[PDB]
């Protein structure tokens, strides 16, 4: 009882609008909240002392007292991992030595194969999840450690944490704990990337290092904070890219001359996968009384019995293809949010019933498996995009458009978007390779204690990487689409001048109505791009057609006029045509190189790309290289700037 | 609301209670209905005319009238696929030539790699779904063609169809169409192995070859019928096997001596993935007041500070592990059921509004992708199992159990379940490899008209294969668990006689009360399976411990020494003569009472009693194969669901 596009539209709004994240043990932190924190520095964290303070302090004292007495708890008085036989009564040194041994990652320096440290955005996200995790009053951590976390987030201090080492996130989390207790070997960023030792970093925000109490080290390092924080920003992005490609399907339909009936509600009602009904519903709305669908209907009414009666699968099958994709992206979002709003930690303190409970809430498998799913789904979005792209580039499938979307009339010096077409293959290829699962590679780890482990963080990173290739593919697809709209609008303007030339030239030469009828039919029916390079060349389809209609016309007539006179006028026709035709077509084209899109639901995307990002029809005469144009679009997608035209486009779809 | 375990119990009930599958275009066909049609031959199809004949006939008539007066629509007057440019008014033979071109699969003969045709259960399931898919009245197929499908189904006639060729299911469907039009080159089974050419098969059930009318060829061949039929039976199995392994996690707890607290509701309340809450809920109920959990806590109270305080992950993290798996299996079931109950076909006839709608309901992507997901989840189920099984085999982790669950005291001639142990690594490895996605290998097909295609049937087959490996692992896991229960029960009886012998021997010999106490404690604490092989060996853990205690004692008592040594000496003489014989007598008795109080009793009785097995040892002549084979094919049969239900009897809500 919703519709995923309202939900995603909902995420986008929360992302730009939110100023304050409420962390209080009760109000849900959403995936858009995590992304906003990571990405927008004006958004601050608010730990609400009125909510959780007391239940956090009751849990704090309960573990204080107790481990201090006899009490045999896994966290406080026991050894760790496969070493849980080792009991001890030295609470503070047990805790600090655990942090010490986990400080075991490695930083890279000139890494060709990957970033050589975990990004600050994800480290900060992880800080938020750890804090939030504590608000359930289940950890036994002190309230001040929590305040400290809050203040580090708000001042933009974060530890530098190694990319690898988590099997899901002891090691990564030890770098937060290390910062907190001021371990000199841990380096920390303060805003400007500027770097200092942890104790100096605590200094600059008015903190002193902590001495860990019983259970505090464990509560700090036990958790899925890194995997989940990253899966959160991954999911946010997957929702908006998803909505992005769905939307771009409607733009593809317009430029390729599709038949919008593929999206008719009865097709989908009768095969009612929610993702299929909802993506179709959106596409139907997008294409309703589009001016390009009118150009399309025109196109298939001319020589109807000679053109494909159906579109190819990349268009007509888009909703059926999108359905599982939207469904896995959507419920993966629900499950990572559930993780985000959980006490992931061990043991779990039940102070009400006076006991510690030994479980495994640190196990990140919910996220790890769902990351494997979404990476497969994004690979599928990429295959959608690559197929559409492919269709657009090939004249036998693009229904009138030139091969490679190449414009400049001389095709021997204009190879159009052929370089992008090649990159799309490269992009998609790498993308499919990345969608193999990570969860199938579990090793029995930590003295065979962790015989089952999620690899959540490794999987999130690979899905993170799949998304980045998707952005490249969308950037290219979108720029090709804009290129296609210009060619569609020029196509139409060229067809008119050819009609006007043929007509006014039939008039001047005294040609009969019969002859004029056929010649004009040809002028309307033959696609210009098949002959734009040399309009008067007898081997190209225009004159091929015209000359055929002349013979057919002299044959129908010849009897009660004069056959000899007809040929003379026809020769004069051809000669005037060799004088005027190419000239008129050129001027119309030159004029176009500095109107139907103006009425389309995709105007926002065309306008954004053409004049907000300042680009133009691609040709041998525009100085910009394909890189320069796609770069701009890509930067807009990477930035979030692409959501402005996306929301303008979807404005008032509601329901 | 809800609860996956209730849903799955619900499927098992439907599976063996249903008699008649209702096909009427309104009442849901469930994944259990497909599996029962496939597997039980007493279940028949009921094509229900009163419910859907009328929209089928109206649609049928619309097509016919659109075609008979000319003459432009994709199904009925156009060329197919990449040749949609081709218009013709030669409607019957157009349909004929479409089937002809799609009869393009290949049968294998002695294939080693694969079965070399699609199995009859899968083919019949496809027939059912193709039938159901026509009930919505969107296809234009004649009612009589549907009645023929019901008849063939109810008469166990089906075409032989090649395993491969679908990109998702033109080719495989062409063979069903090929039967219906009595094409001589397509061969059909009638029940008992026996094969006949299609024309003779129709003849045997009172049918005549159909001559196809406009749209009918397309209507038969356009569709997701084979992919979805396979995914349905796959999904049915994925549900019962899921439940089986969740339940087995509780049996593992019992035999490995775990702490049941890992399943405590507060732990999961606070990390609330429905699958984790729901699996922990089952586990909590299964282990509540368990007589084996009593032994576990009894075990951790002696020498507690030398024994681990937490269980390893395969047990303790099982709810967190299962959560994603139950969720993906559970909602892949919903999505295949949605497919089962849809008009997959093109064009869709909206006779109500006088138009043919051109789309792609034939595109089985929903199924294809969810099959890639389930395959990975069953890989996770297997990893859970392999880990539990590994822990059980290793003395350092099994908490008193002998390495390899090896019984017979003489270990140099008893290597236990080591063969199964090795097999389990082989199963898991292949399973993990199977879980790579198929949907990432989409090729641009059919003159680049199908530039996107689901590969759903191929994906369904690989998930099918994954599940088959999963059955092997559960079979071995289960039979290791029963072996383990016998060992735990024997262990208990053995420790009593050791305590008994030491005690009464200490008296016969007149040992001081301080010495007797220390000797008894050692008998309580030392795990028997560390010395069962040679109880009186000084270098083994018993005598070693006793001899220390005797030294501790003689130092402590200076409050007479020479005679205390004489009495200690006689103690060893006597222990040597009596201890092994007594343990052996008890062991022998045990070979042809705590499980009788276990909720896992039904599994133990079933395996031990109904399948007629015993404790594995050097003197039972049966091989491991022979015992696991019986468990395996009770799992393969569905017979394993009787003990499963008996085990969950009362779980309710
Ligand atoms: O919670 C557990 O069982 C394990 C905790 C741990 C902590 C540090 C290192 C290894 C394991
Ligand atoms: O709907 C389509 O595009 C094509 C269906 C089809 C039918 C037979 C052979 C190939 C394609």
PDB file of C-alpha atoms in Angstrom, chain B residues 71-291:
ATOM      1  CA  UNK B  71      -5.767  -8.587 -40.396  1.00  0.00           C
ATOM      2  CA  UNK B  72      -3.085  -6.833 -38.342  1.00  0.00           C
ATOM      3  CA  UNK B  73      -1.869  -7.860 -34.871  1.00  0.00           C
ATOM      4  CA  UNK B  74       1.329  -9.440 -33.519  1.00  0.00           C
ATOM      5  CA  UNK B  75       0.043 -12.882 -32.546  1.00  0.00           C
ATOM      6  CA  UNK B  76      -2.460 -13.187 -35.346  1.00  0.00           C
ATOM      7  CA  UNK B  77      -1.109 -11.846 -38.666  1.00  0.00           C
ATOM      8  CA  UNK B  78       2.563 -10.967 -38.063  1.00  0.00           C
ATOM      9  CA  UNK B  79       5.985 -12.677 -38.121  1.00  0.00           C
ATOM     10  CA  UNK B  80       7.563 -13.607 -34.769  1.00  0.00           C
ATOM     11  CA  UNK B  81      10.581 -12.208 -32.880  1.00  0.00           C
ATOM     12  CA  UNK B  82      13.062 -10.254 -35.001  1.00  0.00           C
ATOM     13  CA  UNK B  83      10.828 -10.732 -38.071  1.00  0.00           C
ATOM     14  CA  UNK B  84       7.895  -8.639 -36.817  1.00  0.00           C
ATOM     15  CA  UNK B  85       8.085  -6.775 -40.158  1.00  0.00           C
ATOM     16  CA  UNK B  86       6.409  -9.753 -41.851  1.00  0.00           C
ATOM     17  CA  UNK B  87       2.628  -9.606 -42.449  1.00  0.00           C
ATOM     18  CA  UNK B  88       0.597 -12.637 -43.614  1.00  0.00           C
ATOM     19  CA  UNK B  89      -3.050 -13.771 -43.756  1.00  0.00           C
ATOM     20  CA  UNK B  90      -2.116 -17.490 -43.903  1.00  0.00           C
ATOM     21  CA  UNK B  91      -2.937 -18.065 -40.262  1.00  0.00           C
ATOM     22  CA  UNK B  92      -3.025 -21.795 -39.646  1.00  0.00           C
ATOM     23  CA  UNK B  93       0.215 -22.827 -41.296  1.00  0.00           C
ATOM     24  CA  UNK B  94       1.950 -19.804 -39.754  1.00  0.00           C
ATOM     25  CA  UNK B  95       1.319 -21.390 -36.367  1.00  0.00           C
ATOM     26  CA  UNK B  96       2.434 -24.800 -37.684  1.00  0.00           C
ATOM     27  CA  UNK B  97       5.770 -23.453 -38.984  1.00  0.00           C
ATOM     28  CA  UNK B  98       6.493 -21.635 -35.700  1.00  0.00           C
ATOM     29  CA  UNK B  99       6.309 -24.925 -33.754  1.00  0.00           C
ATOM     30  CA  UNK B 100       8.399 -26.585 -36.477  1.00  0.00           C
ATOM     31  CA  UNK B 101      11.203 -24.048 -36.135  1.00  0.00           C
ATOM     32  CA  UNK B 102      11.253 -24.384 -32.331  1.00  0.00           C
ATOM     33  CA  UNK B 103      11.553 -28.177 -32.322  1.00  0.00           C
ATOM     34  CA  UNK B 104      15.261 -27.602 -32.083  1.00  0.00           C
ATOM     35  CA  UNK B 105      16.549 -29.200 -28.886  1.00  0.00           C
ATOM     36  CA  UNK B 106      18.883 -32.201 -28.682  1.00  0.00           C
ATOM     37  CA  UNK B 107      18.656 -35.392 -26.598  1.00  0.00           C
ATOM     38  CA  UNK B 108      21.779 -37.002 -25.175  1.00  0.00           C
ATOM     39  CA  UNK B 109      22.301 -40.733 -24.641  1.00  0.00           C
ATOM     40  CA  UNK B 110      25.026 -41.691 -22.145  1.00  0.00           C
ATOM     41  CA  UNK B 111      25.663 -38.188 -20.808  1.00  0.00           C
ATOM     42  CA  UNK B 112      27.918 -38.189 -17.712  1.00  0.00           C
ATOM     43  CA  UNK B 113      27.537 -34.490 -16.959  1.00  0.00           C
ATOM     44  CA  UNK B 114      23.750 -34.345 -16.918  1.00  0.00           C
ATOM     45  CA  UNK B 115      20.473 -36.257 -17.219  1.00  0.00           C
ATOM     46  CA  UNK B 116      20.104 -35.854 -21.002  1.00  0.00           C
ATOM     47  CA  UNK B 117      16.452 -34.835 -21.036  1.00  0.00           C
ATOM     48  CA  UNK B 118      14.102 -32.880 -18.791  1.00  0.00           C
ATOM     49  CA  UNK B 119      12.512 -35.239 -16.214  1.00  0.00           C
ATOM     50  CA  UNK B 120       8.815 -36.121 -16.549  1.00  0.00           C
ATOM     51  CA  UNK B 121       7.969 -34.447 -13.236  1.00  0.00           C
ATOM     52  CA  UNK B 122       9.318 -31.213 -14.498  1.00  0.00           C
ATOM     53  CA  UNK B 123       7.516 -31.597 -17.837  1.00  0.00           C
ATOM     54  CA  UNK B 124       4.179 -32.338 -16.141  1.00  0.00           C
ATOM     55  CA  UNK B 125       4.626 -29.367 -13.854  1.00  0.00           C
ATOM     56  CA  UNK B 126       5.170 -27.190 -16.972  1.00  0.00           C
ATOM     57  CA  UNK B 127       2.000 -28.616 -18.511  1.00  0.00           C
ATOM     58  CA  UNK B 128       0.053 -27.662 -15.372  1.00  0.00           C
ATOM     59  CA  UNK B 129       1.384 -24.071 -15.406  1.00  0.00           C
ATOM     60  CA  UNK B 130       0.785 -23.613 -19.141  1.00  0.00           C
ATOM     61  CA  UNK B 131      -2.786 -24.746 -18.533  1.00  0.00           C
ATOM     62  CA  UNK B 132      -3.225 -22.449 -15.554  1.00  0.00           C
ATOM     63  CA  UNK B 133      -1.811 -19.548 -17.439  1.00  0.00           C
ATOM     64  CA  UNK B 134      -4.610 -19.867 -20.016  1.00  0.00           C
ATOM     65  CA  UNK B 135      -7.384 -19.629 -17.374  1.00  0.00           C
ATOM     66  CA  UNK B 136      -7.041 -15.809 -17.227  1.00  0.00           C
ATOM     67  CA  UNK B 137      -8.542 -15.419 -20.733  1.00  0.00           C
ATOM     68  CA  UNK B 138      -5.751 -13.370 -22.290  1.00  0.00           C
ATOM     69  CA  UNK B 139      -4.328 -15.884 -24.770  1.00  0.00           C
ATOM     70  CA  UNK B 140      -6.898 -16.678 -27.424  1.00  0.00           C
ATOM     71  CA  UNK B 141      -6.386 -20.442 -27.099  1.00  0.00           C
ATOM     72  CA  UNK B 142      -9.476 -22.663 -27.602  1.00  0.00           C
ATOM     73  CA  UNK B 143     -11.164 -24.183 -24.566  1.00  0.00           C
ATOM     74  CA  UNK B 144     -10.821 -27.611 -26.188  1.00  0.00           C
ATOM     75  CA  UNK B 145      -7.015 -27.257 -26.218  1.00  0.00           C
ATOM     76  CA  UNK B 146      -7.105 -26.673 -22.473  1.00  0.00           C
ATOM     77  CA  UNK B 147      -9.317 -29.727 -21.916  1.00  0.00           C
ATOM     78  CA  UNK B 148      -6.738 -31.768 -23.799  1.00  0.00           C
ATOM     79  CA  UNK B 149      -3.988 -30.584 -21.435  1.00  0.00           C
ATOM     80  CA  UNK B 150      -6.061 -31.611 -18.387  1.00  0.00           C
ATOM     81  CA  UNK B 151      -6.589 -34.990 -20.010  1.00  0.00           C
ATOM     82  CA  UNK B 152      -2.914 -35.567 -20.823  1.00  0.00           C
ATOM     83  CA  UNK B 153      -1.970 -34.488 -17.276  1.00  0.00           C
ATOM     84  CA  UNK B 154      -4.571 -36.771 -15.672  1.00  0.00           C
ATOM     85  CA  UNK B 155      -3.517 -39.619 -17.972  1.00  0.00           C
ATOM     86  CA  UNK B 156       0.199 -39.171 -17.227  1.00  0.00           C
ATOM     87  CA  UNK B 157       1.090 -38.460 -20.854  1.00  0.00           C
ATOM     88  CA  UNK B 158       3.943 -36.009 -21.400  1.00  0.00           C
ATOM     89  CA  UNK B 159       6.439 -35.133 -24.100  1.00  0.00           C
ATOM     90  CA  UNK B 160      10.154 -35.915 -23.829  1.00  0.00           C
ATOM     91  CA  UNK B 161      11.818 -32.531 -23.913  1.00  0.00           C
ATOM     92  CA  UNK B 162      15.546 -31.708 -24.264  1.00  0.00           C
ATOM     93  CA  UNK B 163      17.244 -30.445 -21.131  1.00  0.00           C
ATOM     94  CA  UNK B 164      18.771 -27.350 -22.773  1.00  0.00           C
ATOM     95  CA  UNK B 165      17.910 -24.647 -25.256  1.00  0.00           C
ATOM     96  CA  UNK B 166      15.841 -22.217 -23.245  1.00  0.00           C
ATOM     97  CA  UNK B 167      16.926 -18.704 -22.381  1.00  0.00           C
ATOM     98  CA  UNK B 168      13.538 -18.292 -20.657  1.00  0.00           C
ATOM     99  CA  UNK B 169      10.704 -21.218 -22.628  1.00  0.00           C
ATOM    100  CA  UNK B 170      10.228 -21.460 -26.374  1.00  0.00           C
ATOM    101  CA  UNK B 171      11.981 -24.700 -27.298  1.00  0.00           C
ATOM    102  CA  UNK B 172      10.751 -26.776 -24.280  1.00  0.00           C
ATOM    103  CA  UNK B 173       7.224 -25.471 -24.845  1.00  0.00           C
ATOM    104  CA  UNK B 174       7.382 -26.358 -28.546  1.00  0.00           C
ATOM    105  CA  UNK B 175       7.426 -30.029 -27.464  1.00  0.00           C
ATOM    106  CA  UNK B 176       4.149 -29.656 -25.597  1.00  0.00           C
ATOM    107  CA  UNK B 177       2.646 -27.905 -28.603  1.00  0.00           C
ATOM    108  CA  UNK B 178       4.261 -30.683 -30.676  1.00  0.00           C
ATOM    109  CA  UNK B 179       2.399 -33.348 -28.772  1.00  0.00           C
ATOM    110  CA  UNK B 180      -0.937 -31.494 -29.022  1.00  0.00           C
ATOM    111  CA  UNK B 181      -0.680 -31.241 -32.798  1.00  0.00           C
ATOM    112  CA  UNK B 182       0.491 -34.861 -33.062  1.00  0.00           C
ATOM    113  CA  UNK B 183       3.887 -34.146 -34.623  1.00  0.00           C
ATOM    114  CA  UNK B 184       5.477 -37.580 -35.396  1.00  0.00           C
ATOM    115  CA  UNK B 185       9.008 -36.584 -34.469  1.00  0.00           C
ATOM    116  CA  UNK B 186       8.015 -35.782 -30.869  1.00  0.00           C
ATOM    117  CA  UNK B 187       7.922 -38.705 -28.505  1.00  0.00           C
ATOM    118  CA  UNK B 188       5.677 -39.059 -25.472  1.00  0.00           C
ATOM    119  CA  UNK B 189       5.675 -41.114 -22.291  1.00  0.00           C
ATOM    120  CA  UNK B 190       2.579 -42.856 -20.968  1.00  0.00           C
ATOM    121  CA  UNK B 191       3.186 -43.616 -17.284  1.00  0.00           C
ATOM    122  CA  UNK B 192       5.247 -46.831 -17.035  1.00  0.00           C
ATOM    123  CA  UNK B 193       8.453 -45.954 -18.918  1.00  0.00           C
ATOM    124  CA  UNK B 194       6.746 -46.873 -22.245  1.00  0.00           C
ATOM    125  CA  UNK B 195       7.285 -44.404 -25.129  1.00  0.00           C
ATOM    126  CA  UNK B 196       5.254 -43.629 -28.269  1.00  0.00           C
ATOM    127  CA  UNK B 197       5.168 -41.076 -31.096  1.00  0.00           C
ATOM    128  CA  UNK B 198       2.904 -38.120 -30.264  1.00  0.00           C
ATOM    129  CA  UNK B 199       0.093 -39.165 -32.690  1.00  0.00           C
ATOM    130  CA  UNK B 200      -0.232 -42.537 -30.982  1.00  0.00           C
ATOM    131  CA  UNK B 201      -0.099 -40.947 -27.539  1.00  0.00           C
ATOM    132  CA  UNK B 202      -3.078 -38.651 -28.249  1.00  0.00           C
ATOM    133  CA  UNK B 203      -4.820 -41.674 -29.690  1.00  0.00           C
ATOM    134  CA  UNK B 204      -4.351 -43.657 -26.453  1.00  0.00           C
ATOM    135  CA  UNK B 205      -6.175 -41.050 -24.391  1.00  0.00           C
ATOM    136  CA  UNK B 206      -8.975 -40.506 -26.935  1.00  0.00           C
ATOM    137  CA  UNK B 207      -7.622 -37.329 -28.558  1.00  0.00           C
ATOM    138  CA  UNK B 208      -7.058 -36.248 -32.192  1.00  0.00           C
ATOM    139  CA  UNK B 209      -4.204 -33.970 -33.389  1.00  0.00           C
ATOM    140  CA  UNK B 210      -5.267 -30.308 -33.221  1.00  0.00           C
ATOM    141  CA  UNK B 211      -5.035 -28.006 -36.205  1.00  0.00           C
ATOM    142  CA  UNK B 212      -3.879 -24.681 -34.798  1.00  0.00           C
ATOM    143  CA  UNK B 213      -5.841 -21.464 -35.270  1.00  0.00           C
ATOM    144  CA  UNK B 214      -4.468 -17.931 -35.289  1.00  0.00           C
ATOM    145  CA  UNK B 215      -2.433 -16.982 -32.192  1.00  0.00           C
ATOM    146  CA  UNK B 216      -2.560 -20.561 -30.863  1.00  0.00           C
ATOM    147  CA  UNK B 217       1.028 -21.554 -31.711  1.00  0.00           C
ATOM    148  CA  UNK B 218       2.393 -18.416 -30.032  1.00  0.00           C
ATOM    149  CA  UNK B 219       0.068 -18.908 -27.075  1.00  0.00           C
ATOM    150  CA  UNK B 220       1.445 -22.407 -26.468  1.00  0.00           C
ATOM    151  CA  UNK B 221       5.137 -21.494 -26.866  1.00  0.00           C
ATOM    152  CA  UNK B 222       5.239 -18.027 -25.283  1.00  0.00           C
ATOM    153  CA  UNK B 223       5.544 -18.439 -21.545  1.00  0.00           C
ATOM    154  CA  UNK B 224       7.650 -19.101 -18.455  1.00  0.00           C
ATOM    155  CA  UNK B 225       6.114 -22.541 -17.851  1.00  0.00           C
ATOM    156  CA  UNK B 226       9.217 -24.716 -17.583  1.00  0.00           C
ATOM    157  CA  UNK B 227      11.348 -22.261 -15.573  1.00  0.00           C
ATOM    158  CA  UNK B 228       8.512 -21.581 -13.168  1.00  0.00           C
ATOM    159  CA  UNK B 229       7.466 -25.228 -12.835  1.00  0.00           C
ATOM    160  CA  UNK B 230      11.007 -26.177 -11.866  1.00  0.00           C
ATOM    161  CA  UNK B 231      11.289 -23.204  -9.478  1.00  0.00           C
ATOM    162  CA  UNK B 232       8.048 -24.255  -7.834  1.00  0.00           C
ATOM    163  CA  UNK B 233       9.304 -27.742  -6.903  1.00  0.00           C
ATOM    164  CA  UNK B 234      12.700 -26.245  -6.018  1.00  0.00           C
ATOM    165  CA  UNK B 235      10.911 -23.757  -3.741  1.00  0.00           C
ATOM    166  CA  UNK B 236       8.755 -26.403  -2.122  1.00  0.00           C
ATOM    167  CA  UNK B 237      11.920 -28.372  -1.269  1.00  0.00           C
ATOM    168  CA  UNK B 238      13.783 -25.253  -0.169  1.00  0.00           C
ATOM    169  CA  UNK B 239      11.054 -24.645   2.387  1.00  0.00           C
ATOM    170  CA  UNK B 240      10.979 -28.156   3.918  1.00  0.00           C
ATOM    171  CA  UNK B 241      14.757 -28.484   3.940  1.00  0.00           C
ATOM    172  CA  UNK B 242      15.027 -25.054   5.531  1.00  0.00           C
ATOM    173  CA  UNK B 243      12.760 -26.187   8.364  1.00  0.00           C
ATOM    174  CA  UNK B 244      14.606 -29.484   8.682  1.00  0.00           C
ATOM    175  CA  UNK B 245      17.938 -27.729   9.221  1.00  0.00           C
ATOM    176  CA  UNK B 246      16.575 -25.141  11.637  1.00  0.00           C
ATOM    177  CA  UNK B 247      15.291 -28.015  13.717  1.00  0.00           C
ATOM    178  CA  UNK B 248      18.549 -29.922  13.388  1.00  0.00           C
ATOM    179  CA  UNK B 249      20.356 -26.934  14.873  1.00  0.00           C
ATOM    180  CA  UNK B 250      18.531 -27.807  18.120  1.00  0.00           C
ATOM    181  CA  UNK B 251      19.590 -31.414  17.957  1.00  0.00           C
ATOM    182  CA  UNK B 252      23.186 -30.194  17.510  1.00  0.00           C
ATOM    183  CA  UNK B 253      22.833 -28.104  20.627  1.00  0.00           C
ATOM    184  CA  UNK B 254      21.667 -31.151  22.534  1.00  0.00           C
ATOM    185  CA  UNK B 255      24.493 -33.393  21.416  1.00  0.00           C
ATOM    186  CA  UNK B 256      27.353 -30.875  21.469  1.00  0.00           C
ATOM    187  CA  UNK B 257      26.376 -29.667  24.960  1.00  0.00           C
ATOM    188  CA  UNK B 258      25.628 -26.063  24.015  1.00  0.00           C
ATOM    189  CA  UNK B 259      24.119 -23.230  26.029  1.00  0.00           C
ATOM    190  CA  UNK B 260      20.518 -22.854  24.907  1.00  0.00           C
ATOM    191  CA  UNK B 261      20.639 -19.228  26.030  1.00  0.00           C
ATOM    192  CA  UNK B 262      21.766 -18.177  22.546  1.00  0.00           C
ATOM    193  CA  UNK B 263      18.114 -18.580  21.515  1.00  0.00           C
ATOM    194  CA  UNK B 264      16.797 -16.341  24.308  1.00  0.00           C
ATOM    195  CA  UNK B 265      14.075 -14.023  22.896  1.00  0.00           C
ATOM    196  CA  UNK B 266      15.602 -10.835  24.367  1.00  0.00           C
ATOM    197  CA  UNK B 267      18.751 -11.288  22.261  1.00  0.00           C
ATOM    198  CA  UNK B 268      16.749 -11.232  19.043  1.00  0.00           C
ATOM    199  CA  UNK B 269      14.005  -8.817  20.166  1.00  0.00           C
ATOM    200  CA  UNK B 270      16.791  -6.274  20.069  1.00  0.00           C
ATOM    201  CA  UNK B 271      18.060  -7.212  16.590  1.00  0.00           C
ATOM    202  CA  UNK B 272      14.711  -7.920  15.006  1.00  0.00           C
ATOM    203  CA  UNK B 273      15.160  -9.493  11.543  1.00  0.00           C
ATOM    204  CA  UNK B 274      11.938 -11.561  11.336  1.00  0.00           C
ATOM    205  CA  UNK B 275      13.955 -14.624  10.250  1.00  0.00           C
ATOM    206  CA  UNK B 276      16.223 -14.384  13.317  1.00  0.00           C
ATOM    207  CA  UNK B 277      13.358 -13.853  15.754  1.00  0.00           C
ATOM    208  CA  UNK B 278      11.451 -16.741  14.187  1.00  0.00           C
ATOM    209  CA  UNK B 279      14.294 -19.258  14.032  1.00  0.00           C
ATOM    210  CA  UNK B 280      15.381 -18.417  17.603  1.00  0.00           C
ATOM    211  CA  UNK B 281      11.749 -18.851  18.687  1.00  0.00           C
ATOM    212  CA  UNK B 282      11.735 -22.412  17.300  1.00  0.00           C
ATOM    213  CA  UNK B 283      15.071 -23.190  18.913  1.00  0.00           C
ATOM    214  CA  UNK B 284      14.026 -21.822  22.291  1.00  0.00           C
ATOM    215  CA  UNK B 285      10.913 -24.047  22.231  1.00  0.00           C
ATOM    216  CA  UNK B 286      12.827 -27.136  21.102  1.00  0.00           C
ATOM    217  CA  UNK B 287      15.406 -26.843  23.908  1.00  0.00           C
ATOM    218  CA  UNK B 288      13.102 -25.790  26.798  1.00  0.00           C
ATOM    219  CA  UNK B 289      13.413 -28.296  29.705  1.00  0.00           C
ATOM    220  CA  UNK B 290      15.605 -30.648  27.595  1.00  0.00           C
ATOM    221  CA  UNK B 291      17.194 -33.603  29.441  1.00  0.00           C
TER     222      UNK B 291
END
